[PDB]
Amino acid sequence: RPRFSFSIAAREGKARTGTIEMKRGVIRTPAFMPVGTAATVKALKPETVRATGADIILGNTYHLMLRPGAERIAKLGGLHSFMGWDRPILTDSGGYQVMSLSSLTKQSEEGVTFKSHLDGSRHMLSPERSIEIQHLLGSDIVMAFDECTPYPATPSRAASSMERSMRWAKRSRDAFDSRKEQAENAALFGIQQGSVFENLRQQSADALAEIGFDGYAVGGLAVGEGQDEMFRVLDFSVPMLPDDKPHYLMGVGKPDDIVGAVERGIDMFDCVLPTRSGRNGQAFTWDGPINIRNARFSEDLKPLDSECHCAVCQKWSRAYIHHLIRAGEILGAMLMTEHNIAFYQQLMQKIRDSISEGRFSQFAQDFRARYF
Amino acid sequence: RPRFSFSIAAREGKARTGTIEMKRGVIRTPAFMPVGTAATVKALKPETVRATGADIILGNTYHLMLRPGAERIAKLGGLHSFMGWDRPILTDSGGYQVMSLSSLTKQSEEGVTFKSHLDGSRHMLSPERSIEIQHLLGSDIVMAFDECTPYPATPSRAASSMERSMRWAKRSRDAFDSRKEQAENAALFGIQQGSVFENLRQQSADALAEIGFDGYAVGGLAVGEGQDEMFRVLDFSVPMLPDDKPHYLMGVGKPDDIVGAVERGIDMFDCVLPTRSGRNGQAFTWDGPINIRNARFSEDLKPLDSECHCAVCQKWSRAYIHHLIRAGEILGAMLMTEHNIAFYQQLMQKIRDSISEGRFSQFAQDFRARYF
Numbered sequence A, B: 001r002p003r004f005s006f007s008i009a010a011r012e013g014k015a016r017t018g019t020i021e022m023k024r025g026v027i028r029t030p031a032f033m034p035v036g037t038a039a040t041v042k043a044l045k046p047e048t049v050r051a052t053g054a055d056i057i058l059g060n061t062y063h064l065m066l067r068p069g070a071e072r073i074a075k076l077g078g079l080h081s082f083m084g085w086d087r088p089i090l091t092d093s094g095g096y097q098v099m100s101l102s103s104l105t106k107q108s109e110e111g112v113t114f115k116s117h118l119d120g121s122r123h124m125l126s127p128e129r130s131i132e133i134q135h136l137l138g139s140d141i142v143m144a145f146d147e148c149t150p151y152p153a154t155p156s157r158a159a160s161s162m163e164r165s166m167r168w169a170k171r172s173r174d175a176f177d178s179r180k181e182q183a184e185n186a187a188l189f190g191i192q193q194g195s196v197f198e199n200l201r202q203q204s205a206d207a208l209a210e211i212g213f214d215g216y217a218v219g220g221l222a223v224g225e226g227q228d229e230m231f232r233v234l235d236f237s238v239p240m241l242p243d244d245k246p247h248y249l250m251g252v253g254k255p256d257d258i259v260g261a262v263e264r265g266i267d268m269f270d271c272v273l274p275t276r277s278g279r280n281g282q283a284f285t286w287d288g289p290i291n292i293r294n295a296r297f298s299e300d301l302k303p304l305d306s307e308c309h310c311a312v313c314q315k316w317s318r319a320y321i322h323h324l325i326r327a328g329e330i331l332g333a334m335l336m337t338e339h340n341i342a343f344y345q346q347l348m349q350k351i352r353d354s355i356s357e358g359r360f361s362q363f364a365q366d367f368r369a370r371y372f
């Protein structure tokens, strides 16, 4: 396979279905990427993640640079070898989680200095260092280092962050290109900013296309604006991005949000929602999510979902999983997580099939009627 | 297969190797039984437990009567169906864990009244109720309800508890026999008491043989007496039990203890040691246990054990597992537990092969030289 090749096989309105070919494998789009926090997809062996249908997973750069260390993972042979996942891996830049999870962050034009929420140590993440860490991890899809904008944001603050992010996008591109092995074996995605402002989103898209990237992410959404607002921003933002490259909506996982985002031109998704759902007891079903801990499931012999084809639904009952979760048993988390990730993959498969078959609009309608 | 059939294929000194045939399957002895606390073998799917070579698992009656409930598990179809393990299951009587984990225990000749360490509720466990709960669970090997003796124990207190236990052994036998389905499909094991006193152990064995059971357990050991003392008691106690029936040493799991116990005539074992080892970071190797959390394993690319054939040792490094455990990741517990249980099963296989081949003494010697 080539370093990177995105091909669109079918379309329906703004929706697209196709494939991304990379050295480590093929990624079917629209794609959902399970999240690996500390070099592990919570409570699942990599073989189990693949069994659910996942073609690619996301790796948390912020946690990895802290916990095991980027240089250490490189010395050990890279993230793929370290965790046992040999397919593509998309790594975020670490900038977002720096503002969310770290302490005493000092920002500047060079980058951001911060203290670890673990040992209390200090690090200086910049466009160059972020690109370098992702290289050390052996990432297949590298995310440009940006400055996310807090919601709500004023036009001037949103413009300032967006402009800085574009300057950082150019630095990320140059850093990526100067490293021969990375430029020849991995891909680089640029991230669009501009908050909820159309003119800013347009300026960001133009700057991003001018630099040139393998894919484009719509950043700055799913930050507390609500679905209607998010969809409204997607309506005008996605068409601004190059049509022939992948469109990635960062941090969006709710099933209805995914369906709506695909209808607006999004090709890639990721989310900790499935992995955290099996932490508090939420299991996705075609009839909406259910909290397995509720007393009504104590003697329910039916599987989590009536049509789900995952191993969990083939072998265990709601009653058993209800018991496991309430007992705080590890198997409960393993079972809940596997089902949820499988559910998401089945959702993506149904989306891909309906688009290929010219019946995606009908699918979206049927899905919502039942789910809500 | 028949309800119960123990056959000895080979012997070497006091050591034996053979099989126990039951309706749900064959159990190769000497056997090690992984422990299922709350209807689950900690961090492992039942298919994974079987993959390690386990022929039978132990179910914690005390926890099951509290957490999901005996009557509820029966309404749901039994423990086997509930947790997804279709092979034999040995269930303890619940008497031991009642004295160890419950509050305000009131003992009498009828049984024991106690308060749950969970909700603070109250229950009255007796020989009859214990036998009934194990029936409701659908247990294959039922343990008689006894009164364990605290270490150290005076001759009079040890005699009193032993005598009560024998009266309770008769009540357990009668309760088991009066329930047609249980008597025809399950087996009943009697438990020998008498602390460290030879005459008491002899009186217990005679009373037990007089009543008649499918197997005999040596109870009251591994309660703080030390290996030398435990071995000393086993030296005279095991020969007192019927030769043609299984000998089960309760709550003994250390590898060296298992080897020594087999040399003294023990056929069955169980222990939470493997499951708890992967909780604090202890991994068994043929060169002795290692604490994976230690800094020396941070960049160790070798598997947990150099010759172990488990999937964990085939796919992941010490470095990765070290990271997972220190990060508190669920996958760390899953991986550690699977390896440890596999290690124990490989230990039992090596013991069975060496006995069948008339080289068990040599194996015991070689194992100790390397392990210590």
Ligand SMILES: Nc1cc(CSc2ncc[nH]2)c2nc(N)[nH]c(=O)c2c1
Binding pocket: A035, A092, A093, A094, A095, A096, A146, A148, A149, A191, A218, A219, A220, A221, A222, A223, A250, A251, A252, A270, A271, A272
């Ligand atoms: N919503 C959102 C989520 C993420 C993290 S990817 C993720 N989120 C949740 C789990 N994983 C984002 N990351 C970056 N770098 N920039 C963004 O604008 C941004 C926006």
Ligand SMILES: Nc1cc(CSc2ncc[nH]2)c2nc(N)[nH]c(=O)c2c1
Binding pocket: B035, B092, B093, B094, B095, B096, B146, B148, B149, B191, B218, B219, B220, B221, B222, B223, B250, B251, B252, B270, B271, B272
């Ligand atoms: N040592 C020991 C362990 C156990 C529990 S089985 C178990 N122990 C640890 C995990 N599982 C015992 N149980 C009973 N009923 N009677 C005993 O004398 C006794 C002695």
Ligand SMILES: [Zn+2]
Binding pocket: A304, A305, A308, A309, A310, A311, A312, A313, A314, A339, A340, A342, A343
């Ligand atoms: Zn399922």
Ligand SMILES: [Zn+2]
Binding pocket: B304, B305, B308, B309, B310, B311, B312, B313, B314, B339, B340, B342, B343
């Ligand atoms: Zn192993």
